[PDB]
């Protein structure tokens, strides 16, 4: 977890087809008050990866969520996925190290968890 | 994916211990108008299941959303998480079918799809 | 609810539809002094099932193998699979409980575990 | 951008601590005529990675397996495994192209799938 240029990155893996996801929009947002606020908004390049997700600004710890816009994402292939996107949710308790959340993507499951 | 009776059940399996997840409160909302809408609330049993989590209402076609309070459950165990929740946003394509949504749970790690 | 019932089931979900896969041949083996001894076969149900894979034995604490044929399943759904066939070692620690093993299926991609 | 490296890389994600699971004994075989033959044995590093699995030798299109050493992992840190190692069953098709297998790691469950 050893500290990028960017505090975090994300990386979508299609497990049907064994490639990336590519040029799937992924929105990153703050929890605040009750609501979310929305501090980006990226697609992931031709290997299915956003290596600097958070905006360039100071970030600071608390509860956060990562959104992957997958089920356009299949519905654009003309495919139907059982989840009309993806939101996970995770805690920054440092802001001095990397956070990487990768997704392992399939029409009617998936896995996500805080990479290496 | 035959109807059954409530439409709707999850199942959450911690795959650290092999062992269900017990008295876990999970929510479920719906996806209105004006934003999400909560339609009810209640905890996994001994087996770690919810078999009936819809409220007494018809369920309409759209997307809903379950969110697993795993990171209090973690805490009761003095573990931390990765996530402080997990939502798993679905959508009800049909609903004369029965809906099951499990969650295999790990501290930093976790999968969800559509159960049978 | 399961104690009376034979001591191991399985079951193949395809993640990429949502539903069994059926007809999909999975062998059971079991560990010996250096090697492995063959000690059932059996297909799949239409529900992606194998109620009793169990042959007529004593069992005795020890490791085993499950291999699920999931190469040939995916031929068949004219599709390309990253793994020939997905073997899943397991330890079977007392022999008066019930051992089941899913298997979450994706043509580049698998998740196991024990089942609750 | 793996292209250039060795052609088969592995690496072990401990789910439940969110770290890499380092020291962990990864083997390498082919499947031939008569039966299975060992190609090579590497252990992970600090990052829980083996980037140079592919011994000093040509290599040929066709099945292969790598065994995951995991029970043995878990019994240092005394815990218990659902699985006494994780064998993975796979196939080359194209020698000009580099394989990654990750694994995704808990005492009771696991994933593994074809990496970028």
């Given at each position: 977890h050893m500290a990028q240029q960017n505090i975090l990155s994300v990386h979508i893996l299609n497990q049907q087809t064994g490639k990336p996801a590519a040029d799937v929009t992924v929105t990153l947002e703050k929890k605040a008050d009750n609501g979310w606020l929305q501090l980006?908004?990226?697609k992931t390049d031709k290997?299915?990866?956003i290596?600097?997700?958070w905006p360039e600004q100071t970030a600071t710890t608390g509860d956060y969520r990562v959104?992957?816009?997958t089920g356009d994402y299949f519905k654009k292939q003309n495919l139907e996925s059982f989840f009309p996107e993806i939101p996970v949710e995770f805690h920054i308790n440092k802001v001095n190290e990397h956070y990487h959340v990768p997704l392992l993507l399939s029409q009617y499951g998936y896995s996500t968890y805080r990479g290496s």
């Open positions: 980006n908004t990226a290997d299915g990866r290596k600097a997700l959104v992957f816009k």
